[model samples]
Target chain A: FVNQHLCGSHLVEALYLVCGERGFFYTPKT
Target chain B: GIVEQCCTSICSLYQLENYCN
Candidate 1:
């Protein structure tokens, strides 16, 4: 169950990275 | 049929979760 969260992080981000979307909705340094 | 609520680069897993439940 603990591992599922970690894997979910990777799985979702990987999909987003490949798909070209806003993974992080926050703004960076000014 | 097509899906407008989701299914695109904009739809994240969090958004998907809402639809799932």
Candidate 2:
């Protein structure tokens, strides 16, 4: 429905939190 | 596979995908 990216004061950190719900851990690309 | 995306660490972020069209 969305880009599926987490949005907040900090985008990357929010994403990790959400995905981690399913144990879907990851690292942001540089 | 998301696991295949090889995401790790706190900064880890991936595009939420719609596998269906």
Candidate 3:
């Protein structure tokens, strides 16, 4: 399992929803 | 190369998807 070190995000939860261990969903807009 | 000037990274990502798989 790859643990993600979220580099930039205002919301950690939002980051979790996006780029967590699985890296499933990100904002796709940065 | 700026924000409020966007889509470059998005388009770069579009190109990135080609390398994704």
Q: Which has the greatest DockQ?
A: 2
List model 1 lDDT by residue over A1-30, tens digit each: 011221334544533543454333321123
Each model's TM-score? 0.27, 0.24, 0.22
For residues B1-21, write the lDDT of model 2, one tens digit per residue.
433232332223334321111
DockQ for candidate 2, C-alpha atoms? 0.08
TM-score of chain A of 2: 0.35
lDDT of 1 by residue, B1-21 (tens): 012323222344444333221
Model 3, span B1-21: residue lDDT tens: 212112222222332223221
| Candidate 3 residue lDDT tens string, A1-30 | 232222334223433444445543333434
TM-score of chain B of each: 0.33, 0.17, 0.28
Off by over 4 Å in 3: A1-10, A22-30, B1-21
- Tell me what fraction of the real C-alpha contacts between chains A and B each candidate also makes: 0.00, 0.00, 0.00
How close is each model in CA RMSD to the real structure?
A: 12.6, 9.4, 11.1
Model 2 Cα lDDT, one tens digit per residue, A8-30:
33453544455554443343344
lDDT of 3 at A11: 29
Clashes (N, CA, C under 3 Å) per candidate: 0, 7, 1
- After superposition on all CA atoms, how large is the RMSD of candidate 1? 12.6
- The candidate, 2 or 3, that scores higher on lDDT is 2
